[PDB]
């Protein structure tokens, strides 16, 4: 299915790395923090083309029965399909600190001020090749 | 449920370190590679009190609608209820090669050689706390 991690907590001070490619001709794919496939605290995706959405992160949260939040977009984009990717992520209990592969980051909130997750997951266009959750 | 890492390919040449606290009062737990809970080609089973069986360490593979083949067991067995444990395993197309915590290890064929698995889990008596697979 997607590939995940799930019940191995990812809790406040670790730090969690995943690598993967992204497919050819992909049009998104995305990196998901939280609770269940509807219960997601940080949803990153990354855009390649959808809609009227080309080259651009967007961040979000999807409450479980409710639905998604307000968007946070990001023009930072070193990503290209058929290639690899490495992220890193941390969080305290107000903002998940993400960095990209050449370095650069983005921060977003933490808005249920969670201490813990129980399922990490990729979906969409690209796979995963390696994760560090330690 | 168990704890699981699922569709991120644990290949050839690859190393898994898996690291967890066994609880009080366990009966067994296992650490499983393979390709879902009915296929699974290396099932490392940690035996505190199982039958007839106490403080042994017994491996073995599953055949999808097929059952349970030959049994190995192994006597090392420095785990406590109640402690961390940590695990390393690597694997060529003829063996699982396991390291324990305490710098021991044993060798299980890999009876199917098989190149790649898609699910690692661990079920029963414990919980995992951090996982590197690359």
Redesign the interface.
């Given at each position: 299915?997607?590939?995940?991690?799930?019940?191995?907590?990812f809790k406040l001070g670790?730090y969690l790395t995943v690598?993967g490619v992204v497919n050819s001709n992909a049009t998104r794919f995305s990196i998901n923090v939280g609770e269940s496939t509807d219960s997601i605290a940080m949803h990153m995706d990354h855009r390649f083309s959808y809609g009227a959405d080309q080259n651009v992160l967007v961040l979000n949260s999807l409450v479980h029965n409710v639905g998604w939040q307000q968007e946070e977009r990001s023009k930072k984009f070193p990503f290209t399909k058929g290639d690899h990717f490495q992220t890193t992520i941390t969080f305290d209990t107000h903002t998940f600190y993400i960095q990209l592969s050449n370095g650069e980051t983005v921060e977003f909130p933490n808005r249920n001020k969670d201490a813990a997750f129980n399922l990490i997951y990729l979906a969409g266009d690209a796979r995963?090749?390696?994760?560090?959750?330690?």
């Open positions: 299915d997607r590939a995940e991690v799930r019940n191995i907590p670790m690598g995963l090749t390696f994760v560090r959750l330690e």
